[PDB]
Design an enzyme around this catalytic site. Structure first.
Site, PDB file in Angstrom:
ATOM      1  N   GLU A  12      64.640  65.178  54.014  1.00  0.00           N
ATOM      2  CA  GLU A  12      63.708  64.108  53.650  1.00  0.00           C
ATOM      3  C   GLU A  12      63.937  62.772  54.403  1.00  0.00           C
ATOM      4  O   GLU A  12      63.351  61.762  54.023  1.00  0.00           O
ATOM      5  CB  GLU A  12      63.691  63.876  52.123  1.00  0.00           C
ATOM      6  N   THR A  17      58.881  64.512  60.804  1.00  0.00           N
ATOM      7  CA  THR A  17      57.834  63.515  61.053  1.00  0.00           C
ATOM      8  C   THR A  17      57.963  62.951  62.480  1.00  0.00           C
ATOM      9  O   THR A  17      56.967  62.799  63.180  1.00  0.00           O
ATOM     10  CB  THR A  17      57.891  62.380  60.004  1.00  0.00           C
ATOM     11  N   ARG A 147      53.508  68.568  54.509  1.00  0.00           N
ATOM     12  CA  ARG A 147      54.845  69.117  54.308  1.00  0.00           C
ATOM     13  C   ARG A 147      54.777  70.640  54.328  1.00  0.00           C
ATOM     14  O   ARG A 147      54.246  71.268  53.410  1.00  0.00           O
ATOM     15  CB  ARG A 147      55.456  68.613  52.994  1.00  0.00           C
ATOM     16  N   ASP A 169      65.392  69.761  66.099  1.00  0.00           N
ATOM     17  CA  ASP A 169      65.612  69.433  64.696  1.00  0.00           C
ATOM     18  C   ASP A 169      66.095  70.691  63.983  1.00  0.00           C
ATOM     19  O   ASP A 169      65.317  71.612  63.743  1.00  0.00           O
ATOM     20  CB  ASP A 169      64.310  68.910  64.075  1.00  0.00           C
ATOM     21  N   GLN A 173      67.836  74.154  56.866  1.00  0.00           N
ATOM     22  CA  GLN A 173      68.257  75.551  56.857  1.00  0.00           C
ATOM     23  C   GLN A 173      69.741  75.656  57.222  1.00  0.00           C
ATOM     24  O   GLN A 173      70.176  75.109  58.242  1.00  0.00           O
ATOM     25  CB  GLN A 173      67.388  76.370  57.824  1.00  0.00           C
TER      26      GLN A 173
HETATM   27  N1  LIG Z   1      56.417  55.849  53.652  1.00  0.00           N
HETATM   28  C1  LIG Z   1      57.172  56.548  54.527  1.00  0.00           C
HETATM   29  N2  LIG Z   1      57.259  57.889  54.394  1.00  0.00           N
HETATM   30  C2  LIG Z   1      58.003  58.624  55.265  1.00  0.00           C
HETATM   31  C3  LIG Z   1      58.705  57.955  56.364  1.00  0.00           C
HETATM   32  N3  LIG Z   1      59.360  58.916  57.063  1.00  0.00           N
HETATM   33  C4  LIG Z   1      59.080  60.108  56.463  1.00  0.00           C
HETATM   34  N4  LIG Z   1      58.254  59.927  55.413  1.00  0.00           N
HETATM   35  C5  LIG Z   1      57.759  60.942  54.458  1.00  0.00           C
HETATM   36  O1  LIG Z   1      58.917  61.425  53.759  1.00  0.00           O
HETATM   37  C6  LIG Z   1      58.884  62.836  53.628  1.00  0.00           C
HETATM   38  C7  LIG Z   1      60.064  63.437  54.396  1.00  0.00           C
HETATM   39  O2  LIG Z   1      59.848  63.404  55.803  1.00  0.00           O
HETATM   40  P1  LIG Z   1      60.363  64.574  56.776  1.00  0.00           P
HETATM   41  O3  LIG Z   1      59.904  64.312  58.179  1.00  0.00           O
HETATM   42  O4  LIG Z   1      59.854  65.914  56.331  1.00  0.00           O
HETATM   43  O5  LIG Z   1      61.955  64.489  56.656  1.00  0.00           O
HETATM   44  P2  LIG Z   1      62.886  65.742  57.058  1.00  0.00           P
HETATM   45  O6  LIG Z   1      63.181  66.520  55.799  1.00  0.00           O
HETATM   46  O7  LIG Z   1      64.190  65.234  57.633  1.00  0.00           O
HETATM   47  O8  LIG Z   1      62.172  66.597  58.060  1.00  0.00           O
HETATM   48  C8  LIG Z   1      57.502  63.252  54.109  1.00  0.00           C
HETATM   49  O9  LIG Z   1      56.660  63.302  52.938  1.00  0.00           O
HETATM   50  C9  LIG Z   1      57.060  62.133  55.053  1.00  0.00           C
HETATM   51  O10 LIG Z   1      55.645  61.894  55.029  1.00  0.00           O
HETATM   52  C10 LIG Z   1      58.555  56.487  56.443  1.00  0.00           C
HETATM   53  O11 LIG Z   1      59.143  55.831  57.339  1.00  0.00           O
HETATM   54  N5  LIG Z   1      57.806  55.878  55.511  1.00  0.00           N
END
Ligand SMILES: Nc1nc2c(ncn2[C@@H]2O[C@H](COP(=O)(O)OP(=O)(O)O)[C@@H](O)[C@H]2O)c(=O)[nH]1
EC number: 3.6.5.-
Lengths: 316, 35
Positions: A12, A17, A147, A169, A173
């Site tokens: 998260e 992203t 997601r 990335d 997992q």
């Molecule tokens: N508001 C906001 N949401 C974010 C930001 N970065 C990621 N998100 C949201 O947070 C969640 C996690 O992002 P993700 O890219 O899946 O993180 P990952 O688990 O490391 O791949 C998703 O719902 C994204 O839309 C940010 O800078 N601001």
């Protein structure tokens, strides 16, 4: 010319992203036809989100503002189960709108630091008017917000300023010692993502230190590991928009009991920056490259990735 | 170091599952307080 990039950081934190942003900025991005394909996942993400909140209301013993919502909530599970993947009926739309609007559901949503609510929840649920229509077409931002589940390592490749980037990335997992060693092998730069807004999350039951301190422990380990002497360490202090919204109502002392500064965005963000950069034990030799980021903001990612690219170039 | 792998696997797994991808049967089991 060949540049191997490793995205690391907590689940998260914004890793996938960023991957999507590289596709938008340095690749072809998303056409309208591709966007249409994300419609189902937009709907499921939206329904998972309101369901996650309904579940927490049960655990947290928060009642609905109006008792009629309980039937809506009961109905939500039936209607979502009636399916039609990729299509929202008038009745499902109605049920979700009245739930999202309920004063108890809102009370629970504002208590999200007590449970695990994804950061795309507010985005979709606040855009229900646009989203629920049978003619709805997902914008590029909608797609960026999606997601999905994934199968292991993700890699996008792109050329920028005459460099061949390979961005890996590893994700959430679980991977054996050997897969990690392979990943670390030949790495130019590491980008470490941190969700700033995780500072106020409740401790899990088996957790000795909070999410931010675990992130720090990991970063200390990466940043001081002698294997990474010539590896460019980039630190993304991400979700700064969400951090700015929270810092007013949730003191940073939740995460850092010793914090004596004010709860302005400025002082609390700086404080976190120091907590991270101070873990560097080879200050004279090693430089951390820190940026405050909103990974969901395409312009910001473009600007930040531009500065990062200039860093990787100069390091020759 | 093996210490780094422990941290990585623990720290990168964390966060919000059941809130990813298309709707699945398990995500739709009624909460006990609604029964
Ligand atoms: N508001 C906001 N949401 C974010 C930001 N970065 C990621 N998100 C949201 O947070 C969640 C996690 O992002 P993700 O890219 O899946 O993180 P990952 O688990 O490391 O791949 C998703 O719902 C994204 O839309 C940010 O800078 N601001």
């Amino acid at each position: 010319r060949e540049v191997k990039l490793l995205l690391l950081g907590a689940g998260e934190s914004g890793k996938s992203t960023i991957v999507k942003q590289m596709k938008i900025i340095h690749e072809a991005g998303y056409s309208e036809e591709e966007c249409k394909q994300y419609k189902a996942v937009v709907y499921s993400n939206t329904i998972q989100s309101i369901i996650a909140i309904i579940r927490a209301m049960g655990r947290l013993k928060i009642d609905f503002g109006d008792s009629a919502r309980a039937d809506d909530a009961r109905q939500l599970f039936v209607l979502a189960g009636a399916a039609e993947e990729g299509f929202m009926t008038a009745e499902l739309a109605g049920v979700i709108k009245r739930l999202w609007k309920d004063s108890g559901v809102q009370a629970c949503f504002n208590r999200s630091r007590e449970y695990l609510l994804n950061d795309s929840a507010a985005y979709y649920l606040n855009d229900l008017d646009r989203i629920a229509q049978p003619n709805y077409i997902p914008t590029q931002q909608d797609v960026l917000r999606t997601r999905v589940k994934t199968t292991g390592i993700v890699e996008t490749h792109f050329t920028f300023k005459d460099l061949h980037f390979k961005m890996f990335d590893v994700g959430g997992q679980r991977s054996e010692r050997k897969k990690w060693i392979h990943c670390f092998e030949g790495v130019t730069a590491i980008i470490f993502c941190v969700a700033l807004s995780d500072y106020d999350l409740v401790l899990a039951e088996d957790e000795e230190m909070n999410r931010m301190h675990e992130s720090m422990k990991l970063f200390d380990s990466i940043c001081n590991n002698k294997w990474f002497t010539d590896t460019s360490i980039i630190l993304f202090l991400n979700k700064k928009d969400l951090f700015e919204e929270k810092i007013k109502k949730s003191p940073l002392t939740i995460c850092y009991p010793e914090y004596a500064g004010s709860n302005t965005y400025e002082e609390a963000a700086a404080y976190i920056q120091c907590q991270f950069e101070d873990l560097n034990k080879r200050k004279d030799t090693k430089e951390i490259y820190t940026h405050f980021t909103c990974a969901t903001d395409t312009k910001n990612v473009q600007f930040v990735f531009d500065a990062v690219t200039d860093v990787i170039i100069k390091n020759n | 170091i093996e210490g780094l792998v422990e941290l990585l696997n623990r720290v990168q797994s964390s966060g919000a599952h059941d809130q990813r991808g298309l709707l699945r049967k398990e995500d739709l089991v009624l909460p006990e307080f609604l029964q």
